[PDB]
Amino acid sequence: PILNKLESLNQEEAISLHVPGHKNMTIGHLSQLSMTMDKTEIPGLDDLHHPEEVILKSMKQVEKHSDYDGYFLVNGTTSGILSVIQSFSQKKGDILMARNVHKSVLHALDISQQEGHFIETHQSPLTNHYNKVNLHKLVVLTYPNYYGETFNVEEVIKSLHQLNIPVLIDEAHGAHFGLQGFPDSTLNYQADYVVQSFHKTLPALTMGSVLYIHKNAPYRENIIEYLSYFQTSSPSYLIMASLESAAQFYKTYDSTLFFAKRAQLIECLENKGFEMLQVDDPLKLLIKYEGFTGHDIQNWFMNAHIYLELADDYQALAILPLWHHDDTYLFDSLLRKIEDMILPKKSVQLLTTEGNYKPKYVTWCDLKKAKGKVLARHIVPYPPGIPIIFKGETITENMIELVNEYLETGMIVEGIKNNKILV
Amino acid sequence: PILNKLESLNQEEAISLHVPGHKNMTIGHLSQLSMTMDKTEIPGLDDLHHPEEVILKSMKQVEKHSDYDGYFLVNGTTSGILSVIQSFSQKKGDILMARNVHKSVLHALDISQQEGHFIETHQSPLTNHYNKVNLHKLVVLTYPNYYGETFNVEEVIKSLHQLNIPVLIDEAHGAHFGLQGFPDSTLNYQADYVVQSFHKTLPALTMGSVLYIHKNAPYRENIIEYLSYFQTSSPSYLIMASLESAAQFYKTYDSTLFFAKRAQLIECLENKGFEMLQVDDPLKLLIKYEGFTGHDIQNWFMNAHIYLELADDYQALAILPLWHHDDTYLFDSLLRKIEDMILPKKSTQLLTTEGNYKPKWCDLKKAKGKVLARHIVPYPPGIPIIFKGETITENMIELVNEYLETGMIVEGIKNNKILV
Numbered sequence A: 001p002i003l004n005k006l007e008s009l010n011q012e013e014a015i016s017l018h019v020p021g022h023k024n025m026t027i028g029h030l031s032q033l034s035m036t037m038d039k040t041e042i043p044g045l046d047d048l049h050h051p052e053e054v055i056l057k058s059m060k061q062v063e064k065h066s067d068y069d070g071y072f073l074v075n076g077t078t079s080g081i082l083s084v085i086q087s088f089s090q091k092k093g094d095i096l097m098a099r100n101v102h103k104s105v106l107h108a109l110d111i112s113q114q115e116g117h118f119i120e121t122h123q124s125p126l127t128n129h130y131n132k133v134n135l136h137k138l139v140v141l142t143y144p145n146y147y148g149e150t151f152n153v154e155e156v157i158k159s160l161h162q163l164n165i166p167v168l169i170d171e172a173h174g175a176h177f178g179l180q181g182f183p184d185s186t187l188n189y190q191a192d193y194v195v196q197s198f199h200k201t202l203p204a205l206t207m208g209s210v211l212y213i214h215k216n217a218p219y220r221e222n223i224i225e226y227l228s229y230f231q232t233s234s235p236s237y238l239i240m241a242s243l244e245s246a247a248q249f250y251k252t253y254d255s256t257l258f259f260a261k262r263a264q265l266i267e268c269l270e271n272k273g274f275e276m277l278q279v280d281d282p283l284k285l286l287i288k289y290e291g292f293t294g295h296d297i298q299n300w301f302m303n304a305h306i307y308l309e310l311a312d313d314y315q316a317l318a319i320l321p322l323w324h325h326d327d328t329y330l331f332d333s334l335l336r337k338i339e340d341m342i343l344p345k346k347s348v349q350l351l352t353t354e355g356n357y358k359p360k361y362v363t364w365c366d367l368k369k370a371k372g373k374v375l376a377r378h379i380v381p382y383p384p385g386i387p388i389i390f391k392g393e394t395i396t397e398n399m400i401e402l403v404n405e406y407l408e409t410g411m412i413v414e415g416i417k418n419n420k421i422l423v
Numbered sequence B: 001p002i003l004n005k006l007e008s009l010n011q012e013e014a015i016s017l018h019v020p021g022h023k024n025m026t027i028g029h030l031s032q033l034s035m036t037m038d039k040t041e042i043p044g045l046d047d048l049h050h051p052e053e054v055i056l057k058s059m060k061q062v063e064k065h066s067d068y069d070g071y072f073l074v075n076g077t078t079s080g081i082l083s084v085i086q087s088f089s090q091k092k093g094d095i096l097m098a099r100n101v102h103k104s105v106l107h108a109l110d111i112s113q114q115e116g117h118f119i120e121t122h123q124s125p126l127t128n129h130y131n132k133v134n135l136h137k138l139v140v141l142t143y144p145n146y147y148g149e150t151f152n153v154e155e156v157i158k159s160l161h162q163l164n165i166p167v168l169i170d171e172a173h174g175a176h177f178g179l180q181g182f183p184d185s186t187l188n189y190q191a192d193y194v195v196q197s198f199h200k201t202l203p204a205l206t207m208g209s210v211l212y213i214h215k216n217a218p219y220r221e222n223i224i225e226y227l228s229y230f231q232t233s234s235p236s237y238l239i240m241a242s243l244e245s246a247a248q249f250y251k252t253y254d255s256t257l258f259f260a261k262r263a264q265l266i267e268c269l270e271n272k273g274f275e276m277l278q279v280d281d282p283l284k285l286l287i288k289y290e291g292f293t294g295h296d297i298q299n300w301f302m303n304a305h306i307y308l309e310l311a312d313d314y315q316a317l318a319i320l321p322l323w324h325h326d327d328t329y330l331f332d333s334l335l336r337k338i339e340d341m342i343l344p345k346k347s348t349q350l351l352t353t354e355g356n357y358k359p360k361w362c363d364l365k366k367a368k369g370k371v372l373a374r375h376i377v378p379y380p381p382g383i384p385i386i387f388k389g390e391t392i393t394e395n396m397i398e399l400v401n402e403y404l405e406t407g408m409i410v411e412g413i414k415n416n417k418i419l420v
Ligand SMILES: *Cc1c(COP(=O)(O)O)cnc(C)c1O
Pocket: A075, A076, A077, A078, A079, A102, A104, A142, A145, A146, A170, A172, A173, A197, A207, A208, A209, B232, B233, B234
């Protein structure tokens, strides 16, 4: 079944504007890999969880900044994130968190049983999504957010260090950061831990990621040991080789061709009546169309066998390829598919406050009576279909008000049934 | 450098007798895959963490037994082991363990902070490794051991269920079990959880495994949820595709040719003067040569560009290919290489006792009552006899001192001290 669908997508010549960043083997040099290289810890090849030969030499090549050591991840940024946070489990204090931390961070606090606390987290006026925080054993921040928006993370990092708190930057969507024309990575701002999902925006295979640890960061050794707990003992050499290939691609990339093709794409879309929101990251294209939803726009592109990354009620997200001179991306077919598209005629508040998290039988309780209690299931308003209140939080006056405001306006709200909340 | 090595292995026609089970893409049908198919949760493809379409349908085809639901694992059997154990964390009692449990089991107790206890575990007179247990919220057993040795596991599972204890069976080396002429899987013995590393002995890609959860098993929905915690949010469709392929390979496999080719290889090996230990699983071949070590053997084989799985002092282990009529394996070259090899002329009592585990340098003589902080690993055979988190006893000290008395290399020991 899976193979049958994958073959069918191949025959329809599907065009990727989605993860991973090799774009159905059109961007990058992964054509140099082959499955015959899917091997194991035989002498001559090294051992990821004990690297002292060809993998360590490769690790020295994945380096982007001289204050950091890099480590290969085969179980995604997820595994980096589990390994950094687990190392704090026996230390006093709690873990501070933006409201747009990835679920992996909440999974880490749950399985390790650690106290948490959400930082005041604010909404973009552009994207309607979380995009910045305002200020105790660790801080976790997402940078960029999913939609490629940045904020003054450097200053936050400095501020937290003056209080002696280390920071973990979830840089899942900033693996391409540092290339000419793009935003800067947090590797430049003395972040203690920075995990990047190579596979999401670079030509690495799905699941490939890298954890960068600052050479002075707390619990370095423990963290390195947990990477060998949270990743299989049988790590993939295909994935590892793709990290290596993708790192070489990052090292020698020239972006001039990208910025030209990007301009052409926007031209083409705009002449079709689409409206794009320019975020800080040029790789992330947000497409709107007056009178219609992102899901509608997602569907329209799919009907042309072009596959976007995701959508919300407001807009759809294209993650652009890292186009280069020798790529096999179907650029002309992309632009030609957009031109001939037949579109219709055109027509037509997140929780920001701080909060405690506890890593904790359940029951539905009336909102009015749920105050002071621990939430047992996420509240997810549509739009934007991401959580405003996570399970583990203590329910407040303010939360109930905003949640009733949602319901009064007829906004779909998951984690609520019959005007009750799970506790 | 990683690629350069991988390429030079291909340029020297490396012959695999190691994991994974596609054997340098000579065994199986993974030539139907392409890295063009390395995609994501776009519409049409499903979602491994919330499967209700193509991946759910594929799970149904992964079924080996109607009493179980199979779940794809892209982070190995490891992720499966972590998911099962985590679910018992808030429940009272300890996790009972064979002394040859894999490191992920101890990792799991450590991350989840659960009490453990080791079961009496015996040493094989054949392999001199741990091969069998002798009899409380959960029991974790390894079946088969990685040398392909089995034991009366059915009988142990029945005794435990009568004491109302569920069992997790680490079947990492039993993915090919149930095939004609091979031992049977614990899926037949009502085991509550069975984890199989498809990639190790079937033609699936490295990292691809399957967790089978009995439909009555304790904490089913919690375990299924934790699968989405311990695995990446971006699971590889290549790996999933490879498990789907490996399943179809299992179900359609005819092993008549395997046993013919196995016998011809043993014939060839015997004629060179190698001594082969016959273990319960036909897929595992244990090679000896009188006067020399398993390491020596592995070297001699590497010099012929034949790669064995691993070795200890006693023996070198070969994991055989699941040969078939349309495979592309270099069988003649293997025999040729063995034939014309130029070989020289011919020329550890493990701790079996039960013991408690706590998820938490001292003279060995003064160590009784302290909790071990680093594994004690005798060479040979180079696997732990006493694990970090165990309480040191008079008998452990006696045993370990006799190790040292006799010139046996012991890791975890420095200046006759142990780490506490
Ligand atoms: C995808 C993602 C992750 C997780 O990385 P994987 O490589 O999918 O494990 C973490 N944080 C954010 C913001 C992500 O988008």
